[PDB]
Structure formats: structure tokens, C-alpha cells
């Protein structure tokens, strides 16, 4: 009936920028050097995924099986699953461990026992339990061409690049390790690659005022450089064992007032564009561990209540998602030097959403060999409603406007594994990791 999310976590490992610098980022809690035993990174080891992974001693196969069994027990069916690999910078381990991990995931899902990743994916394509996709997180300094190629090979279809704030002084003063220009370049390469980028933000960094935060978010949703596809809000928490904890203890940093924080969240939600999704607004770190930060977990509800009080309303994807009189609405804009399109079906008066799609013309910076002739791309298709079927309409219209407006000759789609068969049924062939159709 619906896809089930399966969360797995990796083994502990130090972040890469510790060598040429002195330390890791000044606020990230946990880690192998921290005081939490088996703290992978950015994780104390108390969230359900944390000890769920610890019980399997960070084994891919065992974690997958345990989560599948738990979900199957409570009525939920497991025909379709989505993997989430958490646990800090994954693309810094030696290649062998990464290959091991992903191949074990695929074989656990399928049942076949594979040697390399290619055999694992070839067999998992034929499985009865289909995998929609995989999502990984990565620092901007590890999202160059080779890393993107590797992510394409693994079948991952969604990045989680975290750029904390647009200001460069903030980055240089927190020992993040890179620059904002690198973040913009990484977004450019990812968008022209054909992924679905979702960014991380932290709206309470030191030396940042409330006015600065409002301005930076307005720029973030206005500057054509960033314009991300999905956003997560992580208000800063002062956890013991980090440099930020030392700063706060030294009486040189204070947290935002709870009412101020709620109001700021309200404005940020009200400013969100329609085509941008808000995955999360809070962090699941256990309460009695943080010395100073958010009030309680009731953060989304207070934000919505205050927004309703002040007359503002949020029009993001999650709130507007769920016969009724539906109609086709089209939106276009620019991001990272690319012409983005947002074909969708919706019902205006009741402001509900049914089906959506994401197109994009390919820029001149594309490097993947499958994209070298003015190829378009379909970054994402998603339908959760019911009536020919809406998906046929969306694909037909998208191909039409690719042939006519974009002036392209070839169209490509990114997919998981069962989606490969779904798109092949409508007349596509497979080339590399992409699903291609010759558009006249």
C-alpha cells in the first residue's frame, strides 16, 4: 500500500577534515573521540535507530532483517522499501568497506548472495520486494565527479548535502573546513547529474542575529544559486563534549528565546515556496542530554498555531499533500544555471495535491556520458492518489514539453530497481544507471 522507510547506520569513523585542521566542526556531538561509546557521528546513541543498529553491531544484513521483521509484525506490508544510510560522512571510508556495505544491503533485501556490487544490483532488479531508492549524506568537499559516479552505481537517488549557513564567516569560524562557493559548485554538479538534492540548515549559529537569519533565509529561497528541492530545519543544540559546549559554559553564547524561536520558525515556514518540501523541523536528540537549546518536541505544532494566529499560511509539499475537481498547474524557475519545471496536478480551493513531476534542461557543465547531446532529464515522479491514471498524463506532457520547449532529442530518467521495470513497460530502455527513451 505504501513504501516503508528503513534506517541503517554505519560504523564509527573520524570525519576527513581532522588531519589538515585541528578538530572536527565545533558543534557536532559524538564520535569515536567523544565520551559516548559507539557514537558514530552526530549521534549520542539513544535514538531508536541508534541502539537498533548497536544491537546488530553495525551489520547491514542483521539491521535490515530486524527492521523488516518489526515492520511486518505490525500489519505493515513490505513490498516497497526505502533505505536511509545515516551516520556522518559515509563517502570517506576506503572503497572496500562501502562496496561491502551496499552489496550486503542489496543481498539482504533480495536473498541472492553476491560478490561485487554489480551482481547484487543485477539480482535485486529481479526481486519480489522492490527498492524505490537509497539516500546518503555527504559533505560538499566529497561530492566531486568520482563520488557522484559511485553514488550513481550504488543506485542512490537523493543527496543530503548539509550547508549550515550562507555566510562565509560562520563557516570559517566553526572550522567546517570548506567554503560556500564549494557548496554552490556541488549543487550545480548534483543538479546537472540528475539527483534530488535536499539541504540541511541550522538557524542558531554563533555570531548570527535574528535579522541575519531572516535575511539569509530570504536570500536562500530567492538567490538562484541555492533554490533547493527539500529542506530540513535543525535548531542548534548545546551538547556536552563539543567546542560549542565550551563556548556556552564560558558565558559567551546564549540561545534564542522560545517565543522568538517559534516566531522565527513561523516566518520561515510562511516564506517557503510551493515546490519545496520540508522534511523535518527538529532534531531527535534526547531531551535530558542537551544543556541549552529547544524547549520540547512540540515544535511543529506551536509553529502552525502561531502561523494561523498571525494570518500566515505554509504552502509546502507536506502540508498540501493528502472525484475532487483537479487541474494541471505548471511552474518554472531557474536554479544553478538550469531551467527547472514543476508540472503538477492539484485542486485549488481545497489546496490539496495529487501528482507531481520534476523536469530540467541539462546545462553545459554535464559530464556523464549518457548526457552529451542536449538530453533532458526527469529528476522525480511521485503519485499517491487515485482516479488511464495520472502518471501516464504526467509522463506524456513532460515528454511533449521536452520535445517542444527544450528542443531536446533524448530524455532520461533516474530510478530505483522496480521503477526500472515500470518505465521499461511504457517503452524505455536501460543505459548505464539511467532509463532512456529516444524522443524523436
Amino acid at each position: 500500500s505504501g513504501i516503508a522507510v528503513v534506517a541503517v547506520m554505519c560504523k564509527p569513523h573520524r570525519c576527513p577534515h581532522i588531519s589538515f585542521t585541528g578538530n572536527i566542526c565545533v558543534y557536532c556531538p559524538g564520535g569515536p573521540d567523544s565520551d559516548f561509546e559507539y557514537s558514530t557521528q552526530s549521534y549520542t546513541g539513544y535514538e531508536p535507530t541508534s541502539m537498533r543498529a548497536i544491537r546488530a553491531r553495525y551489520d547491514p544484513f542483521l539491521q535490515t532483517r530486524h527492521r523488516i521483521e518489526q515492520l511486518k509484525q505490525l500489519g505493515h506490508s513490505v513490498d516497497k522499501v526505502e533505505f536511509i544510510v545515516m551516520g556522518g560522512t559515509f563517502m570517506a571510508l576506503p572503497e572496500e568497506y562501502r562496496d561491502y556495505f551496499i552489496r550486503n544491503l542489496h543481498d539482504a533485501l533480495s536473498g541472492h548472495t553476491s560478490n561485487n556490487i554489480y551482481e547484487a544490483v543485477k539480482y535485486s532488479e529481479r526481486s519480489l520486494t522492490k527498492c524505490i531508492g537509497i539516500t546518503i549524506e555527504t559533505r560538499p568537499d566529497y561530492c566531486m565527479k568520482r563520488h557522484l559516479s559511485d553514488m550513481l552505481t550504488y543506485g542512490c537517488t537523493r543527496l543530503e548535502i548539509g550547508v549550515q549557513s550562507v555566510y562565509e564567516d560562520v563557516a570559517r569560524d566553526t572550522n567546517r573546513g570548506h567554503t560556500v562557493k564549494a557548496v554552490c559548485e556541488s549543487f550545480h554538479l548534483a543538479k546537472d547529474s540528475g539527483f534530488k538534492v535536499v539541504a540541511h540548515m541550522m538557524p542558531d549559529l554563533p555570531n548570527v542575529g535574528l535579522e541575519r537569519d531572516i535575511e539569509q533565509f530570504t536570500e536562500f529561497f530567492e538567490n538562484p544559486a541555492f533554490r533547493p528541492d527539500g529542506l530540513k530545519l535543525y535548531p542548534t543544540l548545546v551538547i556536552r563534549g563539543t567546542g560549542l559546549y565550551e563556548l556556552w559554559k564560558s558565558g559567551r553564547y546564549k540561545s534564542y528565546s522560545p517565543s522568538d524561536l517559534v516566531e522565527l520558525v513561523a516566518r520561515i515556514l510562511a516564506l517557503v515556496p510551493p515546490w519545496t518540501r520540508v522534511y523535518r523541523v527538529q532534531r531527535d536528540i534526547p531531551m535530558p542530554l542537551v544543556s541549552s537549546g529547544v524547549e520540547h518536541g512540540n515544535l511543529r505544532e506551536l509553529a502552525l498555531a502561531r502561523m494561523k494566529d498571525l494570518g500566515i499560511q505554509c504552502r509546502d509539499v507536506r502540508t498540501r499533500e493528502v472525484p475532487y475537481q483537479v487541474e494541471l498547474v505548471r511552474r518554472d524557475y531557474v536554479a544553478n544555471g538550469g531551467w527547472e519545471t514543476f508540472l503538477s496536478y492539484e485542486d485549488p480551493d481545497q489546496d490539496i495535491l495529487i501528482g507531481l513531476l520534476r523536469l530540467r534542461k541539462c546545462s553545459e557543465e554535464t559530464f556523464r556520458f549518457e548526457l552529451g547531446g542536449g538530453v533532458s532529464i526527469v529528476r522525480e515522479l511521485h503519485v499517491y492518489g487515485s482516479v488511464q491514471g495520472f502518471g501516464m498524463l504526467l509522463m506524456e506532457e513532460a515528454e511533449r514539453i521536452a520535445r517542444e520547449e527544450h528542443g531536446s532529442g533524448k530524455i532520461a530518467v533516474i530510478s530505483g530497481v522496480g521503477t526500472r521495470n515500470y518505465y521499461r513497460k511504457i517503452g524505455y530502455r536501460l543505459q548505464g544507471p539511467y532509463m532512456v527513451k529516444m524522443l524523436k
Binding site: 569515536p32 573521540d33 559507539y38 553491531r57 553495525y58 532483517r65 536473498g111 548472495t113 560478490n115 551482481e119 543485477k122 539480482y123 529481479r126 519480489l128
Partner: protein, 702 residues
């Protein structure tokens, strides 16, 4: 040079365990890149069938028509090759290689042909690979060739079985598939027309098996849909079903055995499932409706397993192969037919072993593996038989990290390292001491008791190294430790000395600029040698607390590349170094007690050239007259050699070194060697381990 004992465990694949049917029978499970022959009568393996380059996946005996024990067998691995093995008496005569089948081979089957004109053991082989292909191989004498092939396009073959039509000699083939459509048909050029394709199951069919026919060909079908269906062939087909939850992956009928001159063919089945369950379906007396006989397995526990189950001769026992490389043998109670008991079998690490060390007294050996486990092996005295067998006694800890270095201080006190920053110390409890004294002077434990009830406590936790520990060592007096960390800068890579009685740092020698591979004290206990990845070595001397006495810059080093291992001499007069440059160099200084000469350190002897990279050099501890030294070298390919060195008069490069016995094909590791530990002497035996998941004990005498 005889191999006394070998420890290993099977691979983690479906169908890796097979057993010949006959008066004796033989198990032929596969380790990393070799096949192991192991008698099950609580005895030891007999031979090792090396030859595969990659992992080994499928093993099957060739069924014998007249009830004789099997003679030949087939193994298909991940090396794109299929090997036919023939043995007369544990001897490995004339293995045969078969090529083709790009991609890993995941299914093989073998049948003796019923040729009437040519009784020259005409054999048929079917092979299904990961390239969605299945191919044939007919063998007569030494003649091997392929035959008609069959593509599946995108579909894949999962389970293969082959048999004959009940009256006419017709070779029938039943192939599992990934589309719930097991295909049964003929294969040869004269008969390859598909006749029928069953569709009973509702999931991937992981098992199909042609049964012993009373009068009609019975057939088993086993899929992931938690159902087992029995199909009867006569050219007509029938269908019967059964019931048992979760994935089911192993079905086999009872074979025929000669009961006092008369062959017998009972009716029985055997099912192994992921839910830690194994069933013994049997037809009913009244209406022939199959009902269970007994539930056996670790129901409700963790570590879901049982990839395979196989059925002993004449139903005497049942063997099963589990997820974590551990077997499970169950035996029938003759007094009570409705009762079975677990039995004692072989075990071993399921991932590459890294290090080991002899008992100071010389009774047991402890291994650590990249499978994140520590295990102990000791012999069993029993009561009467002169034959002595070794077994896995205890499992001190199941750690959550990999293990790389190990050292021994007291007879029950050892220090372990890992891919982390801390060092750990362990002590034997009091229950283990008594259980061991009962074993050496009750019986070796089974699997579950080892897994759950056997562990060791932690006593200490050494801090303050900085990075991942890479090496450990101890002095002769067992009073000063030494360790090094994996490092990439001169500052980090430093030697740390501890005090055993207090577990505190004592001194912090620092001279190397990169990782230190291995260190070694000296029997004189007045020196300490350390080689590094910097293609150099250092020597430190205790003063009457350690200072530098020797030195080696870049130019004054015969070795060109990373030096891997180093060793001392029993007289504490010379020492040896083995590098990755395929060269071993002995350095002589003759400096002991008081030597007022400054430095004067030189090689003093020649240089050799072994066939490959050197990763372990050892010197036998005992000395014999003529002042003739002996060295054991563990190469990289997997072989071990013994050489003898004698000091020349004036020219080092004249017959400096003499050759000795080499390891043969059967007694040689497959991937790489990691240690060569001689048994303690003066109040011959030595042990070798490597990345083959195997541990070997050898013996030699002059």
C-alpha cells in the same frame, strides 16, 4: 613435514555442504578457495583440495549406482571455473578444469550415465552461472567438452536437479528459476524440447530435487512462499502440498542404503528454514497425509540461519549448515526413535585470522580474527585411543570491532588490540580453569554453550595511544610491553612502553616517521628491534631507560620497500628481517654484554631471493651443534619454506644459505600467511595462520 591439525569452517553460501552416501560417506564443504575432506566420526580432516582462485560456492558428489561410496565430485566457485575432482584414497589424482561461464557459477549437478555399450563411467554435468546461462559437460575418460547451451535472457537459474525416466533411460532435468516457474525438460541435442513448466509456488523457488522413485518419479519443490509441494511424474503429473512458515531453502529425500544385502528405500523428507527450524515430514499410515515427526532447532533465539540441511546415511544423523558458518549435527537415539541429540563437529573462524600465540606451557593456541572474535583451541585426551584430537574450547569475547594484534603475559592473561584507540586485558575465570582441567587432566562443548555461556571478563583498559593500534610484543621476562599506532606523521608514530605490574607508560621512544609494522625484544633482554613502513629499522639498548644504539637512514638499507617482519636469534647474536622486496637479510653484530665499539652494525651475510613477497620470518628457538641456523619463511602466495644459514669465512656471497623441505600443494595456505609461531622448547612443532580462515599446526624432525 606433516600437517598435524587444521581448523576451518564452511563458506556462507547456499548448497556449500555435501555428503556422499555409502557405508562411510564423506563431507566436502568449502572454505575460502579450497575444498575440505573431513571424516565426521569426531575425527580430523584428511586432505585439502586446493586450486580455485576465487571463492567456492557449490559442491556435489557423484551418486553411485551400486551403493558403493562415491569416488568423484564436482565443485563450482566464483572463479568462473568448474572443477571435477577425483580421489582414490585421500590423494587428489587428476583434477580437471572447465572454462566458460562468465560470471560466478552458482549451480552444478553431476550424474553417472547409464551407457550400456561403454561402461567407462560416462558422466553428465550441468552448470548454471550468474550470466543467466546454463551449459552442459559430458565426460568420458579424460575427454571433456561442452554441449547445447540454454540462455534465460533476463531470468536466472536457482536450483538444479537431474534424474531419469522410470523405465526408459531418458535424462530429465528440473531447473529452478526466479519466476515461480521451475522448468522440467530434456537437454541433449537429441532431446532438448521443453515439455512442461510448473507454476505451483508463489515466490522464488530456492529448491528442487528429484526423489527416489518407488514406481513413479517423485519430485520436491521448495520456494520462499513458505510452502513445500510434492509432484508425482508418471507422462502425467500430480501435486501434493505441505505447510511451514518463513523461507524454506533445503529439501531432500532419504537415499537408499544397503541393509544387510538388501537395498532399502524409505519415504521421508527434511526441511531447513531461516526461522531456525528443521522438519522431518513423513507420510501417514492411514491416508498418507504428511505430518511432522519432531521440531528441532534453536526456536526463538537470535542469529537466524540454517542455509542448508543434508541427510545422513541410513537416517542415522542429520547435518545442517547455519548462517554464521557453524554446523549443527543431530543424532538419532536408537533406544528412543522419537528423540535426537546434538553432536560434536568441527569449527573455525569465518573470516581471515590475524594472529596467534603458543601457550607458554605449550597446551593451547589462541586466535583472533577479523570476524571480531577470539577463540581458543586445545587437544582432547579422551580416555583410551592413542589418537588425540583438537577442538574449539572457549570463545573469550565477541567484540564489536576488528582485531589485529595480540600478546600473552601470564598463562591466563592476554592483551588484545583492535582498530580503535584503547587496549584491552583479559583474565580467565575460575569455571574455565576447572572445565579445562577436566578436558585435559569432560567433553568438548557444543555450539550453543560456546555462544552464550562462555566469555571472559575485562580487567583493564589502556588509554593514551592516539590512533589505531598496529602491533604488540612482550619481553622474555614478561614484564615490559610495547605497542605502536598506525600513523602518517613522525610525531604520531612512536613506540610506547608500559609496565605490566602497573599498566602505566614508562618511556616514549620516538624515531620513526611512519607506521611500525612489527617489533621484537631479544632473548638476551638487552635490545629491542623495530622495523617501520619507512623501509628502515631501529635498535634500542637498555642502559645500566632505553637509548638509541643503532641507526638506519635511507641510504644504509639494502631493502628497497616496506619491511614486513623481523626476528631475533636464540643466542641473541644475529637477527633477521624480511621485506616485501622478495629479499630476506640477516644482520650480524655479535654485540652482547659490553661492547665499547661504536655502532659497527652490518648485514655481515648474503641476501636471498624467494619467489615472492615475504610477510613472516621466524627462527627456531632450539640450537644444535655445528652452529647452523634454521629459518622458516612464510611467503605471500601461501607457501612456506625452510632455509638453513651458516656463517662463511671471508666471502659472504658463497653458498651462504642452503635449501630444505618446501610445503607441497596439499599443505599450503591459499591467500596469505600472517604468523609463524614456534612451540616453546627447552622445558618440532609450529603453527601458521593467514587470511584463509584456517589455522594449521605442522611437525618436522631431523
Amino acid at each position: 613435514l606433516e600437517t598435524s591439525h587444521v581448523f576451518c569452517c564452511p563458506n556462507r553460501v547456499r548448497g556449500v555442504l555435501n555428503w556422499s552416501s555409502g557405508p562411510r560417506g564423506l563431507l566436502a564443504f568449502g572454505t575460502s578457495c579450497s575444498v575440505v575432506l573431513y571424516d565426521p566420526l569426531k575425527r580430523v580432516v584428511v586432505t585439502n583440495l586446493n586450486g580455485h582462485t576465487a571463492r567456492v560456492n557449490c559442491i556435489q558428489w557423484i551418486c553411485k549406482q551400486d551403493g558403493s561410496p562415491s569416488t568423484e565430485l564436482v565443485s563450482g566457485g566464483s572463479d568462473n571455473q568448474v572443477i571435477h575432482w577425483e580421489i582414490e584414497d585421500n590423494q587428489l589424482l587428476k583434477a580437471v578444469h572447465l572454462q566458460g561461464h562468465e560470471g560466478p557459477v552458482y549451480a552444478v549437478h553431476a550424474v553417472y550415465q547409464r551407457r550400456t555399450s561403454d561402461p567407462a563411467l560416462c558422466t553428465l554435468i550441468v552448470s548454471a552461472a550468474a550470466d543467466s546461462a546454463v551449459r552442459l559437460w559430458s565426460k568420458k575418460g579424460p575427454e571433456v567438452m561442452c554441449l547445447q547451451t540454454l540462455n534465460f535472457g533476463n531470468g536466472f537459474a536457482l536450483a538444479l536437479c537431474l534424474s531419469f525416466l522410470p523405465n526408459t533411460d531418458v535424462p530429465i532435468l528440473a531447473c529452478g528459476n526466479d519466476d515461480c516457474r521451475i522448468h522440467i525438460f530434456a537437454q541433449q541435442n537429441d532431446q532438448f524440447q521443453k515439455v512442461l513448466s510448473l507454476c505451483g509456488h508463489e515466490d522464488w523457488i530456492r529448491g528442487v530435487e528429484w526423489a527416489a522413485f518407488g514406481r513413479d518419479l517423485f519430485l520436491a519443490s521448495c520456494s520462499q512462499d513458505c510452502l513445500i509441494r510434492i509432484w508425482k511424474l508418471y507422462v502425467t503429473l500430480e501435486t501434493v502440498l505441505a505447510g511451514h512458515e518463513n523461507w524454506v531453502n533445503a529439501v531432500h529425500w532419504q537415499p537408499v542404503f544397503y541393509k544387510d544385502g538388501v537395498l532399502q528405500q524409505p519415504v521421508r523428507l527434511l526441511s531447513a528454514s531461516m526461522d531456525k527450524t528443521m522438519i522431518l515430514w513423513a507420510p501417514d499410515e492411514e491416508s498418507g497425509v504428511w505430518l511432522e515427526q519432531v521440531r528441532v532447532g534453536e526456536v526463538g533465539g537470535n542469529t537466524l540461519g540454517f542455509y542448508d540441511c543434508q541427510f545422513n546415511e541410513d537416517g542415522s544423523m542429520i547435518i545442517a549448515h547455519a548462517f554464521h558458518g557453524a554446523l549443527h549435527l543431530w543424532k538419532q537415539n536408537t533406544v528412543n526413535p522419537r528423540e535426537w541429540t546434538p553432536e560434536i563437529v568441527i569449527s573455525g573462524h569465518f573470516d581471515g585470522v590475524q594472529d596467534l600465540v603458543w601457550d607458554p606451557e605449550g597446551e593451547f593456541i589462541i586466535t583472533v580474527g577479523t570476524d571480531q572474535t577470539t577463540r581458543l583451541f586445545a587437544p582432547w585426551k579422551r580416555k583410551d585411543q592413542s589418537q588425540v584430537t583438537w577442538h574449539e574450547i572457549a570463545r573469550p569475547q565477541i567484540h564489536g570491532y576488528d582485531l589485529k594484534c595480540l600478546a600473552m603475559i601470564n598463562r591466563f592473561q592476554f592483551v588484545s588490540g583492535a582498530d580503535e584507540k584503547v587496549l584491552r586485558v583479559f583474565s580467565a575465570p575460575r569455571n574455565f580453569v576447572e572445565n579445562f582441567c577436566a578436558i585435559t587432566g569432560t567433553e568438548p562443548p557444543t555450539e550453543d554453550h560456546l555462544l552464550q555461556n562462555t566469555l571472559w571478563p575485562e580487567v583493564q583498559k589502556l588509554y593514551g595511544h592516539g590512533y589505531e593500534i598496529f602491533c604488540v610484543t612482550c619481553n622474555s621476562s614478561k614484564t615490559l610491553l610495547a605497542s605502536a599506532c598506525k600513523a602518517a606523521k613522525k610525531e604520531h608514530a612512536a613506540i610506547i612502553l608500559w609496565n605490566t605490574t602497573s599498566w602505566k607508560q614508562v618511556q616514549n621512544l620516538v624515531f620513526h616517521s611512519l607506521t611500525v609494522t612489527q617489533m621484537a625484544f631479544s632473548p638476551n633482554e638487552k635490545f629491542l628491534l623495530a622495523v617501520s613502513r619507512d623501509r628502515t629499522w631501529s635498535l634500542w639498548k637498555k642502559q645500566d631507560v632505553f637509548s638509541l644504539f643503532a641507526f638506519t637512514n635511507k641510504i644504509t638499507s639494502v631493502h628497497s620497500r616496506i619491511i614486513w617482519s623481523c626476528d631475533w636469534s636464540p643466542d641473541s647474536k644475529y637477527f633477521f628481517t624480511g621485506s616485501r622486496d622478495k629479499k630476506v637479510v640477516v644482520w650480524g653484530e655479535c654485540d652482547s654484554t659490553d661492547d665499547c665499539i661504536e655502532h659497527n652494525i652490518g648485514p655481515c651475510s648474503s641476501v636471498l631471493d624467494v619467489g615472492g613477497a615475504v610477510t613472516a620470518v621466524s627462527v627456531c628457538p632450539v640450537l644444535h651443534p655445528s652452529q647452523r641456523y634454521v629459518v622458516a619463511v612464510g611467503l605471500e602466495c601461501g607457501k612456506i619454506c625452510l632455509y638453513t644459514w651458516k656463517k662463511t669465512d671471508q666471502v659472504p656471497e658463497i653458498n651462504d644459505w642452503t635449501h630444505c623441505v618446501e610445503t607441497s600443494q596439499s599443505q599450503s595456505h591459499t591467500l596469505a600467511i600472517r604468523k609463524l609461531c614456534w612451540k616453546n622448547c627447552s622445558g618440532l612443532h609450529f603453527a601458521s595462520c593467514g587470511e584463509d580462515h584456517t589455522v594449521k599446526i605442522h611437525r618436522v624432525n631431523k
